């Protein structure tokens, strides 16, 4: 059935006839004499020992058991040798690159029943696999037996043969692609439960790649028109077109993880609330709560928050019928949860539109789905086996079991919005940008080229846009960067009010005087540069060095400039902070930077590949939390290319434009001050959840308590709900789901 | 602990396993007999017999020694002799590319205590490591013992190769890069003196060559905070950059070498001064002066001058409270050397402002230092012993030394 094969059976069949033909010869010359002396020296020599023998001098070992004797036995002898020295000569090479053709990853995936299996395709690749990997195969899972079987063209690497090689029990390989319908039903993609489709984040032409994603989600789909298919999109407007496959069914468990709009509403988040990009990198993160002694205070309690993880439970009986805000704070006060949201549309029409944080009106509907963040599922087991009565008192949760019965809005209403405009119309010199005021602002120094590969900053500044923010409470973002880039971006960024531009180079400290980065409230560092091409280590060379340059800065408070690096490659890290004293092979998180919401890497995007196929909903309540809202109205109307558009809205979808966003509040100053003066953290929440509705996420606190003489630093950690009597000390931030401003 | 070990180990266990196995059978087979004969050829052969045969064969050498009696002790023997090749020709190629995975550069550096050494870094290439090694081991150099250390990513040259042995007493090579910890571990930079930077100064792109080396430059000041570092910077408007690292502090060591700022202002100084461009690419170069009787009259005129260097001495007692002029003439005239500039700002604030040729304003204070240029760094100790009394009319300047107050 093979060519290949064919040609070394007839090499294999060749090779054993002349052998056999020789070994015949030889035995009729050896046995019948030399005519020369008229056949007086011929020997009784059987034929297989003839056989022997030629085998024997045909491996050059020559024992000399059986020998020839005639002298016209040795002269063929002779002659055999040189024929067989000059075959094997002409015929080794094609011997040996027959023995190389045969490939080392063929063959189909065979696995039992009931052993669950995730089809991995795209742009498998070390880097690009190492996070998806840590996440997927991360060790204290609820480890329901899944296999990751890949499905890639090429080789894998020498590091990517030692990942496949340490996770063989689980992780396997095979050669092929996605667009064959035999390689899909090699990897059995018929009875697989996912099919993930990660992607080259680094690619020179994102809508290329992109494109090329959604071809191998239309082969995925006409193969198998009914499998959860988890895609890994560069560009927010590459995701309407799955929406034009017949079987992307969103319902249904597709869902399309956009690295650029992720990543960049990450950060805007950040710019909102500071530290809040590593609040759900670990949130939706699996990571591992192993505190030792060497790790100081501020490090274990910020261990404690990173191994905390987000999580959905269906609602027990007693919550029926009950308020959003007496439910979470029961679940805090009573079972120690952290209830976030509700999904609450189960009522008239649909379900799955997740009510973050909603106001008192909502209330909970008998078998709704909760999401909670605890620190594993068995803690979360007890929001469905509280009752009314066997619970009513009962301390030591672990006994709760087992009861024995004239502004210009966007159309959708999300999102602020502005006639379009020329470039011109904010573009702005150092002159304009030192004349105006800007406070409390958001830079953003993009480093990029005059054809380096889009980013969409619309998913940066969409989220600071958000129509549940005030226009006076806009924070007004300004962007220090190339210009031919934002000639490109502002075909999308056109229509976001309070935008400016300031050309030139961001590492450049007269357009920093310019736009006063010791004012802003946050100075984004984002890096557009085509880059893996080159050493690893090297990727982020421009984004490090603008960090220590805008550090070092002074004005008439350098290091007290609140900026939030993204890192290409995470490694790199370790450069963003000096005090740190780190060791080099610590992961990204547990690093000072990144738990301190300084850093920020893409390849956390990668374990957003891991958690959204075991939560269904994990993705959609990312994206409420981060992106504004991000209704998927929103997206079909940007799918009919005219772009953002909109007017001075009906009320009626304004109805919307007051629901929870994410802020930060002090504990220095204000009606919680009081919690500051060495309360309690459980205090604090049930008490702002009773009087104000707000939730307190986590807390945002010192890294060292900031007295001038423990640490003359701003640095502050992100803890992730800590307990219950945690103390709080007074310079303490809460990271809050506030409503209605 | 290797991957590729695990897999060499795997073979040859394989390979002595399949080797055992098939002694002890064909041991048995050969002394068990024939049941075509029934048996009646079987022959006393020893176990550890059938295995040294076994070996010669497999080395296809074949002695004779030893060797298969029984018919069927023939065919396995011949069978083995098919199983063997086929195991060889679809085996070598892995084992001889684990045999080439061996770096040969790998390994950490060791070094005793007192033995200073150097790291070099960033751009090390024959052509910009040639010159570096020329002057740095240099033959008439007051050789205090210092190994150059390098650091880089791929292998070197064949000359790079051949510059590595013939300095191979002091001159090493490590395979690696600077922004790994555990490189910057094994070259031993905690206990390291400095750690150059090399640069490409033909680079496409001098903005991102120079950015380059400064990450350099932060890994190593992120690993060690306190060490010398010595950059190669191509462009001037990155020099600045280094001022943003915390651990950088110029008082304490740490220069950048600007190949553009450096070459054009030699260039712009000749200018000024024609031949000036090689009068400083000699005073700051070691350079020797081996006079022939080949050369002619001006050419051993110049090679006299290029073989002199700078240096830095205390200024001794005698020149205390003494006006520059005075004392340069002074240091020519007795002391025949040449006094260019000395650290003067050492009065008030903070050291380090060097006064080249100052007027007669400027005084000489106790104990400041003072550049001079002179063969080597013998005739400038000179400066530092010089008395007022005991050397006032001491003509043969080969005996001014170590006055005795
Ligand atoms: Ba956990
Ligand atoms: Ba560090
Ligand atoms: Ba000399």
């Given at each position: 059935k093979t060519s290949t094969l064919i040609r070394l059976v007839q090499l294999v069949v060749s090779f054993v006839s002349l052998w056999l033909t020789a070994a015949g010869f030889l035995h009729l010359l050896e046995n019948s004499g030399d005519?020369?002396?008229?056949?007086?020296?011929?020997?009784?020599?059987?034929?297989?020992?003839?056989?022997?023998?030629?085998?024997?001098?045909?491996?050059?070992?020559?024992?000399?058991?059986?020998?020839?004797?005639?002298?016209?036995?040795?002269?063929?002898?002779?002659?055999?040798?040189?024929?067989?020295?000059?075959?094997?000569?002409?015929?080794?090479?094609?011997?040996?690159?027959?023995?190389?053709?045969?490939?080392?990853?063929?063959?189909?995936?065979?696995?039992?029943?009931?052993?669950?299996?995730?089809?991995?395709?795209?742009?498998?690749?070390?880097?690009?696999?190492?996070?998806?990997?840590?996440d997927f195969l991360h060790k204290d899972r609820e480890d329901v037996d899944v296999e990751i079987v890949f499905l890639h063209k090429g080789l894998p690497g020498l590091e990517l043969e030692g990942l496949l090689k340490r996770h063989f029990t689980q992780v396997e390989?095979?050669?092929?692609?996605?667009?064959?319908?035999?390689?899909?039903?090699?990897?059995?993609?018929?009875?697989?439960?996912?099919?993930?489709?990660?992607?080259?984040?680094?690619?020179?032409?994102?809508?290329?790649?992109?494109?090329?994603?959604?071809?191998?989600?239309?082969?995925?789909?006409?193969?198998?028109?009914?499998?959860?298919?988890?895609?890994?999109?560069?560009?927010?407007?590459?995701?309407?077109?799955?929406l034009n496959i017949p079987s992307w069914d969103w319902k249904r468990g597709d869902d399309a993880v956009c690295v650029a709009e992720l990543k960049l509403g990450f950060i805007a988040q950040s710019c909102l609330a500071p530290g809040f990009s590593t609040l759900m990198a670990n949130?939706?993160?699996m990571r591992s709560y192993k505190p030792t002694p060497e790790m100081s205070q501020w490090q274990?309690?910020?261990?404690?928050?990173?191994?905390?993880?987000?999580?959905?439970?269906?609602?027990?009986?007693?919550?029926?019928?009950?308020?959003?805000?007496?439910?979470?704070?029961?679940?805090?006060?009573?079972?120690?949860?952290?209830?976030?949201?509700?999904?609450?549309?189960?009522?008239?029409?649909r379900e799955s539109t997740?009510?973050?944080?909603?106001?008192?009106?909502?209330?909970?509907?008998?078998?709704?789905?909760?999401?909670?963040?605890?620190?594993?599922?068995?803690?979360?087991?007890?929001?469905?086996?509280?009752?009314?009565?066997?619970?009513?008192?009962?301390?030591?949760?672990?006994?709760?079991?087992?009861?024995?019965?004239?502004?210009?809005?966007?159309?959708?209403?999300?999102?602020?919005?502005?006639?379009?405009?020329?470039?011109?119309?904010?573009?702005?010199?150092?002159?304009?940008?030192?004349?105006?005021?800007?406070?409390?602002?958001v830079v953003v120094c993009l480093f990029a080229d005059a054809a380096s590969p889009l980013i969409g900053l619309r998913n940066l500044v969409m989220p600071l846009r958000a129509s549940n923010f005030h226009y006076h409470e806009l924070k007004p973002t300004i962007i220090v960067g190339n210009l031919d880039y934002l000639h490109r971006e502002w075909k999308t960024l056109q229509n976001f009010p309070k935008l400016s531009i300031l050309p030139g180079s961001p590492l450049n400290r007269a357009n920093l005087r310019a736009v006063n980065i010791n004012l802003c409230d946050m100075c984004v560092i984002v890096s557009a540069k085509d880059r893996n091409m080159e050493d690893p280590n090297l990727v982020d060379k421009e984004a490090i060095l603008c960090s220590l340059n805008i550090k070092a800065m002074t004005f008439d408070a350098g290091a007290n400039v609140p900026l939030i690096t993204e890192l290409a490659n995470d490694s790199n890290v370790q450069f963003l902070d000096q005090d740190d004293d780190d060791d080099p092979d610590?992961?990204?998180?547990?690093?000072?930077?990144?738990?301190?919401?300084?850093?920020?890497?893409?390849?956390?995007?990668?374990?957003?590949?891991?958690?959204?196929?075991?939560?269904?909903?994990?993705?959609?309540?990312?994206?409420?939390?981060?992106?504004?809202?991000?209704?998927?109205?929103?997206?079909?109307?940007?799918?009919?290319?005219?772009?953002?558009?909109?007017?001075?809205?009906?009320?009626?979808?304004?109805?919307?434009?007051?629901?929870?966003?994410?802020?930060?509040?002090?504990?220095?100053?204000?009606?919680?001050?009081?919690?500051?003066?060495?309360?309690h953290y459980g205090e604090l929440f049930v008490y702002a959840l009773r009087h104000f509705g707000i939730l307190c996420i986590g807390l945002y606190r010192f890294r060292d308590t900031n007295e001038s003489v423990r640490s003359p630093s701003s640095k502050r950690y992100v803890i992730t709900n800590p307990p219950e009597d945690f103390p709080l000390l007074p310079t303490d931030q809460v990271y809050v789901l506030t409503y209605k401003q």
């Open positions: 005519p020369f002396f008229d056949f007086g020296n011929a020997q009784h020599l059987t034929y297989w020992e003839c056989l022997y023998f030629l085998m024997v001098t045909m491996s050059t070992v020559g024992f000399g058991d059986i020998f020839a004797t005639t002298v016209l036995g040795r002269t063929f002898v002779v002659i055999f040798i040189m024929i067989f020295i000059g075959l094997f000569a002409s015929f080794i090479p094609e011997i040996a690159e027959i023995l190389g053709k045969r490939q080392k990853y063929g063959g189909s995936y065979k696995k039992e029943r009931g052993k669950r299996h995730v089809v991995v395709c795209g742009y498998i690749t070390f880097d690009s696999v190492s996070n998806f990997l840590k390989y095979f050669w092929g692609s996605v667009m064959d319908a035999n390689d899909l039903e090699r990897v059995k993609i018929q009875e697989a439960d996912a099919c993930l489709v990660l992607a080259n984040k680094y690619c020179q032409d994102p809508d290329q790649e992109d494109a090329a994603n959604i071809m191998r989600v239309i082969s995925i789909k006409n193969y198998h028109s009914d499998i959860k298919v988890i895609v890994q999109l560069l560009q927010y407007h590459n995701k309407a077109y799955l949130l939706f993160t274990t309690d910020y261990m404690r928050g990173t191994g905390m993880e987000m999580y959905t439970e269906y609602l027990s009986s007693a919550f029926n019928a009950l308020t959003f805000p007496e439910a979470a704070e029961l679940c805090f006060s009573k079972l120690k949860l952290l209830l976030l949201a509700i999904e609450v549309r189960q009522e008239d029409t997740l009510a973050i944080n909603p106001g008192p009106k909502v209330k909970i509907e008998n078998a709704t789905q909760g999401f909670f963040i605890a620190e594993s599922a068995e803690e979360v087991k007890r929001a469905f086996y509280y009752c009314k009565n066997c619970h009513a008192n009962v301390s030591d949760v672990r006994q709760i079991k087992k009861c024995k019965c004239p502004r210009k809005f966007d159309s959708t209403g999300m999102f602020h919005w502005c006639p379009d405009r020329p470039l011109n119309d904010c573009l702005q010199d150092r002159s304009q940008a030192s004349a105006s005021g800007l406070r409390n602002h610590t992961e990204l998180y547990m690093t000072q930077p990144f738990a301190c919401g300084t850093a920020f890497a893409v390849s956390v995007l990668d374990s957003l590949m891991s958690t959204s196929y075991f939560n269904d909903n994990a993705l959609t309540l990312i994206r409420t939390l981060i992106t504004g809202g991000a209704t998927p109205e929103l997206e079909q109307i940007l799918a009919e290319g005219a772009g953002m558009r909109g007017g001075y809205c009906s009320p009626a979808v304004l109805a919307n434009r007051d629901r929870c966003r994410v802020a930060q509040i002090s504990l220095f100053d204000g009606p919680l001050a009081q919690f500051g003066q060495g309360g």
